[PDB]
Prior knowledge:
The structure is cut from a larger assembly and holds chains A and B. Chain A is mostly helical. Chain A has 3 domains: 1-300, RNA Polymerase Primary Sigma Factor, CATH 1.10.601.10; 301-378, Orthogonal Bundle (Arc Repressor Mutant, subunit A), CATH 1.10.10.10; 379-458, Orthogonal Bundle (Arc Repressor Mutant, subunit A), CATH 1.10.10. Chain A contains 18 helices and no strands. In chain A, helix 2 packs antiparallel against helix 9 (204-231). Chain B is an alpha+beta fold. Chain B has a domain at 634-773: RNA polymerase Rpb1 funnel domain (Topoisomerase I, Chain A, domain 4). Chain B has a 6-stranded mixed β-sheet with strand order 9-11-10-13-8-12. In chain B, strands 2-3-7 form a 3-stranded mixed β-sheet. A 3-stranded antiparallel β-sheet of chain B has the order 5-4-6. In chain B, helix 30 (927-936) runs antiparallel to helix 32 (1016-1033). At the A-B interface, helix 1, helix 9, helix 11 and helix 16 of A face helix 8, helix 9, helix 11 and helix 12 of B. Chain A: One of its GO terms (cellular component) is cytosolic DNA-directed RNA polymerase complex. Chain A: Keywords: Cytoplasm, DNA-binding, Sigma factor, Transcription, Transcription regulation.
Amino acid sequence: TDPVRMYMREMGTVELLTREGEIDIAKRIEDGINQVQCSVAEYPEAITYLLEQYDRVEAEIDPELAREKFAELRAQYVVTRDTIKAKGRSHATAQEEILKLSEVFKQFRLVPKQFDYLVNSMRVMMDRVRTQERLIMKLCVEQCKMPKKNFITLFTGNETSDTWFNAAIAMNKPWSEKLHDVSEEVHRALQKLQQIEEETGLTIEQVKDINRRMSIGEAKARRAKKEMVEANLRLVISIAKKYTNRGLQFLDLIQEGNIGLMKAVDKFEYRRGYKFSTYATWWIRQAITRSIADQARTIRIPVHMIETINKLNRISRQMLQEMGREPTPEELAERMLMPEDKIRKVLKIAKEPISMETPIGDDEDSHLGDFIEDTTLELPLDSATTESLRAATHDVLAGLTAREAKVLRMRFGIDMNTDYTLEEVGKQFDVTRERIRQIEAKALRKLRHPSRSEVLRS
Amino acid sequence: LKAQTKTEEFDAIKIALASPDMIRSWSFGEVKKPETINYRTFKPERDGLFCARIFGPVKDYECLCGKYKRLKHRGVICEKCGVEVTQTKVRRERMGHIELASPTAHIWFLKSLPSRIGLLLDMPLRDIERVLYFESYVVIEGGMTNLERQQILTEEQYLDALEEFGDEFDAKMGAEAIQALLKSMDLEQECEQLREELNETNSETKRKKLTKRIKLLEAFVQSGNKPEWMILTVLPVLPPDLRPLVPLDGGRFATSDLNDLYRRVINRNNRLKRLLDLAAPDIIVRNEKRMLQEAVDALLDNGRRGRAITGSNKRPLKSLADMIKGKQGRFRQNLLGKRVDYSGRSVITVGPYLRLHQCGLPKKMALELFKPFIYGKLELRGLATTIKAAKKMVEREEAVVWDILDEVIREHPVLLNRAPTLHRLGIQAFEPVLIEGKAIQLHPLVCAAYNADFDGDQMAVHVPLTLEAQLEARALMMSTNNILSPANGEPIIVPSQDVVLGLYYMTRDCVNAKGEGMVLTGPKEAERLYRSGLASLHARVKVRITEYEKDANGELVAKTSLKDTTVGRAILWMIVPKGLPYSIVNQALGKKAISKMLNTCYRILGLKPTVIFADQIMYTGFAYAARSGASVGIDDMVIPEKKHEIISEAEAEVAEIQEQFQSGLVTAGERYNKVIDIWAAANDRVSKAMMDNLQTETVINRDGQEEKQVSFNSIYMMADSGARGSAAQIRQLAGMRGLMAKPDGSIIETPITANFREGLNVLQYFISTHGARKGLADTALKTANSGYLTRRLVDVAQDLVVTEDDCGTHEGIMMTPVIEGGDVKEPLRDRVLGRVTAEDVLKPGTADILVPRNTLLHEQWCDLLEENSVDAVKVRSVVSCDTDFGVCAHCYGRDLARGHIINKGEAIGVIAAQSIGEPGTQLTTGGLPRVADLFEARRPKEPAILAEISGIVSFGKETKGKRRLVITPVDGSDPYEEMIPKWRQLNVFEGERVERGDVISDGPEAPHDILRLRGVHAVTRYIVNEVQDVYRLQGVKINDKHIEVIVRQMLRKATIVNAGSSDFLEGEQVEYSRVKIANRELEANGKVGATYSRDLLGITKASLATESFISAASFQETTRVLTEAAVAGKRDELRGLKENVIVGRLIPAGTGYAYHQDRMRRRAAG
Ligand SMILES: CCCC/C(C)=C/C=C(\C)C(=O)c1c(O)cc([C@H](C)CC/C=C/NC(=O)OC)oc1=O
Ligand SMILES: [Mg+2]
Ligand SMILES: [Zn+2]
Ligand SMILES: [Zn+2]
């Protein structure tokens, strides 16, 4: 019927809250953080990447202090690598310094940008894993006419080595003999796979789980915040009901509002007895106002420009009653920090300005722009003459020494392309430069008889 | 042997749906920012709704960053700023595009009435929207499960039904659904099903709906189009320099509304594009999408929803939709109609030294008008070095140039057109005579065509440039070739008013005058007898004269006589030429007769010598006027001697009828209705009082006693002559002046008994108002109404050219003189002159072929026909004309302002349309709309019914609101029984056989019937015989052809009755059948079949069936045509007229006739 009510009615599913479900979430959010924080705290290459850039930003906010903590971190790793490879305390107590390290990882914040990278990097690296994995199945199950029943029993063991491949061919079953036609292919996918086990530095088996607990941890919080905002549809309106009709149509400010809203929910911290709303209002009033000014007039316009305006707009209406008459830019700029034409330059870029498709009379219902003459195009008797110019002139150059002509025409692009430097015209002809100059002037000496062009002048 | 690739004399136009990829074939880029220009340095920011990076450089041949400003570095692109340097003209050619966040739905097809996205899905309107604004999910390919595909669930249901069937069914909501939907359906499929059900069930609502549905469909398949495309994913944006951003003085600005409108889509979209990446709650993004689809349709056809306001201004903005030119309907709308170079105008006056082929144009306009010809001609003879200066000479108005200009002018006609261009004569070519003044001078004789007086009418002028035009101008448009109204064979370049007073004056006779009874050699001594002061003009006198008569074999035969005439009439005979009877000027000469003199000179000595007559008929006609010194002063307006007498006499009657009324001998409506007669009678008498007295009471005396003769009072001679006046109007000067009717319509039982020569009293005046007011008002309207009418006709004639030579059919219609009860309301001769016959004509007695098969009936022929008592004639008329897609010359007839038979190519449609709608203005159920009733084909309120079938009648069942009437065939199956409302009076005989098409109730009857029942040569006579009672009633002479030719368009459709190849019930162009049956007749197979039945289609409803879609989409709803036309991917193979003009190539009639032909053969040619 009508988009707006729908939005409203749509919002109608109240779903109001008290303080309780308020904060109750904020942790649900926060879990998903850690859970994923923790989830990522797990990644060697997440961290070995952390080293490489650290070396890149440090080979190019207190640097030495920064140089220090990197040490605690750097210390706590290498030990843990040995709690793996030296296999002391078989991923039980060697497991623990693996844990100690991850803790070190779990403190403090950063820059959201490298983040969504790693986030990505993991999962894209996660891609290649199911990349290589999607290869083996179409090549054994669908290819070897091999049942999927038999494919998950034996492949699932390792999913990297060839233990299932050469053990499903010796089972002497009817689906086994087919596995040969792909021996060049199965060898190639398990290779890159173990390679990921090398690139990742973690078993392809164990590397899923972690990536996931992020992924879910992802949901938990994603899911969470979503809920938060829906709470406050009503907030936004109220305020956004303020900024209305300001050179911007309703739903727009409010959408923007629900952005300003939706933003606020992110930067928050419930561990703060400051009550959620008045933290919204700002971030809402933020976008919706800063929304308006930069996208509302048909010409953009910088901010301060907006403000410096309303300064005036307000003052003049303030000025008006002071001098119950009328305020003159000299006067107005007077009441100002402002210079003057600087002002006058200002006046002109207000006005939105009128639509050409405005009606004017009805002499035959005219329209405005039915009347804007062109200025680019060239007059016909204006163009025609030009035509007479090239000719009547070309009419003249022939009357001159065929050697001089090509020397002028070079100087003036005429009948040619780029206008030839009255030097480099020499250089082309040799006999430079002055030499040619005289030739030039020889031309001009003939205007005993230029009653032609002379007249094509005025 | 090459096709081509580059650019070429295309023909025809393809419209259709728009692939996204295909759309991207169009854009030089994606606008992606809502910016415009810089704000301080009024540059255009890239890349956004104006750019250069995309659309083009601002300034001819110039990169944006500006590194490259030379007419050298053209196709180069600036390294920096994505700008090829080229003329700025591209930023008026180039287009853009935008990628959408959400697929989004095209408001034209979603609402342009029968919603394509609707009926194509056979899914109702209300739901889709419901799906779109996210109200409810909809099924799609549910497969063997529990639910239909195009079925719809609520969220909760979807959820319930989700849990039951995990996959294996599909349901969505939001654009993608419908998108999803369309992609997925297969047409070809439903049809064959649709095809069967068509065959499985036999029911009229059904096959009406069904077969009508299918017919739409396979059209779509036949298109090329893809229904996934009725939805938008990428949107093209119109080039910037057309929704410009001009600066004004005082450097405010202005732009077209699209920019607002544009800026809105861009805005929403992005923010939305944004939203996703925020993974914002679908409750918002739902809303977003919903908003986008708003902005869009804002763009496209604002008005089909809440109607986005204009920004800034209250008022509504301009949607592409609104900016379609032609646009029109229904209906309006004129088209002004481009402006034009070489042109101008002013106030106009007389100029009677003008020989019909010329007009007086002022030195000054003529100067600026022909300026270049002058610039050239000046430097040619070399009075000017070079044009630049040549200009300065004419700038300077140097004396030389005046002489010069004369040169450019010599045989160089110009166009002269006046106010509402009615019939093609509203424009007429003259040669120009140079003149001082800033007035245009007019040839008087012509006034009467244009309709121009001189109380300020302005006529405007044009220049025919092309070599061509100067011939077109001279051959066709030139004053002279237009002197026979193409409306109606008579001359239109008749003696107007001033003049015939003069003529009438001369050709007159006073009883006993300066010369009563002498005899002079010949006119030569006749005039000499006058300017000598010796004879009176109109003193009766015998004189020697010679007429000629070319009776013999194409040959001129002389003859002398002592004709017994007057001096004046003698002196006139000087003017007459050769093959004319003296007998022609012997009498008194009315303007009534004097045009008739003119026609005759033309139908016997033909053009040239008709013309030069006409100038001389004028020149003279003025001169003896001025000499006669006719003039009017109060004393001329004779109020009959006995006026006041009667008044009181009838003034009596009334006091009588009163006496009786109060004594109630008699009633009120009675009395009234009584009184008002007698007043009526009085006015007829106080009329015919003066007129009896005014007429002749010129009682005078020669030699003897007294004689009385037709008066010379100044004003009689006005009306008597036809110069001016109407005895109807006279009666208002002398005798009583009518009766006024008050506003009611209800006429007042006490006439305005005084007149103009007498005072009017207050009350007399007062009542007299309302009238003249209402009148003025009428005219103001009848004229608004005449127009909208014509606009419709020409809308529908038009594409109709005299194409075929002689179709060669014997089939024609039967002419009788009109005989309305009493006396012949219109002779049989008028009806038939100029037509070409079906079959040879026999005398009264027989074995006597008078006229043989098809002959074009000239005057002689007629006269022969009238000599023989001859009395009815079958004739060839264009509703007969077998030729399809045109009109054979022969089927037609003859007219032109030129005398001989039509020549191929002339645009008889239009020129039909014209001659009707034109005089329509002067019309008076009845009158004008009563006309529209004919051509609109409107049933009357209460229409008679007729013998549906011939065969004996009988009434069955009973009175159940309607009596079923059962006709009964002697032979055939009898079953015809119609259910009739018996609450109206019958006529038919009850045990009587009823010839199908008999009067079975009385009262008006509805043409579609007459057609269907009685016949074509029947209906086709109804339309005219009845249009004709209107104009005829109004003294208005329009010849039937035209009407027939309209009628022809009315019945362009026909209904099939059998098959083999067409689609059984369908309504189709008797055209396409006439061709298609042919293509079975000995052609492929009998198959079978098919037969049809002719349909009567209202004009307006006729029009809107143009093969040409451009044509048609200018007459009705537009938004529709395109919408509906672009979907079945139509092509417009031109051919029609307008369409060629729009796209401004050459007219396929006229001149351009000769041309097009030359091409249509090369099309389908090898
Ligand atoms: C998009 C669908 C509609 C197409 C049209 C009508 C488009 C019209 C444009 C673009 C004009 O601006 C325009 C023209 O092109 C041309 C003219 C002339 C006055 C032609 C009018 C009469 C035509 N002939 C006719 O009726 O048959 C005798 O007047 C216009 O206003
Ligand atoms: Mg006038
Ligand atoms: Zn550049
Ligand atoms: Zn014909």
